[PDB]
Amino acid sequence: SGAIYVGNYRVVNRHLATHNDWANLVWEDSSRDLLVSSTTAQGCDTIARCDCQTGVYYCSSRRKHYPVSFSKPSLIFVEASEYYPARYQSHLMLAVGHSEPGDCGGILRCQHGVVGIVSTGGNGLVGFADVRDLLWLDE
Numbered sequence: 314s315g316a317i318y319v320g321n322y323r324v325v326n327r328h329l330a331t332h333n334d335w336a337n338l339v340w341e342d343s344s345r346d347l348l349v350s351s352t353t354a355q356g357c358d359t360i361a362r363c364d365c366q367t368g369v370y371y372c373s374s375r376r377k378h379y380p381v382s383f384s385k386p387s388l389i390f391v392e393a394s395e396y397y398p399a400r401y402q403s404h405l406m407l408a409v410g411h412s413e414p415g416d417c418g419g420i421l422r423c424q425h426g427v428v429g430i431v432s433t434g435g436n437g438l439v440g441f442a443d444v445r446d447l448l449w450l451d452e
């Protein structure tokens with residue numbers, strides 16, 4: 314579990330969105346596993362605007378942060394699950410690192426700010442949904 318709070322927005326994994334998130338929906342994209350809902354309180358997370366390929370992510374299954382090198386956002390095949398049929402997930406970045414299903418929502422950050430959130434994994438890999446292209450998160 315986990316979310317990004319920037320201004321009046323809350324960014325979460327679309328498969329973990331609550332009733333409240335959907336009743337306050339701003340934008341959602343099944344192909345990216347992202348959903349953004351509005352908030353009353355102010356968010357103070359900074360979103361990175363960069364092309365970094367190194368950063369640090371929070372891994373709840375280990376209560377630890379890990380440094381990673383990750384790939385550029387791209388279309389990657391993701392196996393079927395209780396939330397989605399088998400499909401290509403866009404804007405996804407992979408890294409070699411530990412992740413378990415409950416790790417989704419852990420933040421990936423670089424020196425410039427928040428890069429994305431854990432969205433997929435397995436087999437010694439971790440996948441992050443990128444948010445650096447969502448320029449509207451700051452306006």
Ligand SMILES: CSc1c(Br)cccc1CC(=O)N1CCC[C@H](C(N)=O)C1
Pocket residue numbers: 328346391394396397402412413414415416417432433434435436
């Ligand atoms: C492959 S199970 C797993 C592992 Br292992 C580590 C980390 C995470 C998982 C769960 C997982 O990847 N998915 C279930 C939830 C929705 C995800 C998606 N984006 O389509 C797919």
Ligand SMILES: [Zn+2]
Pocket residue numbers: 361362363364365423424425426
């Ligand atoms: Zn960066």
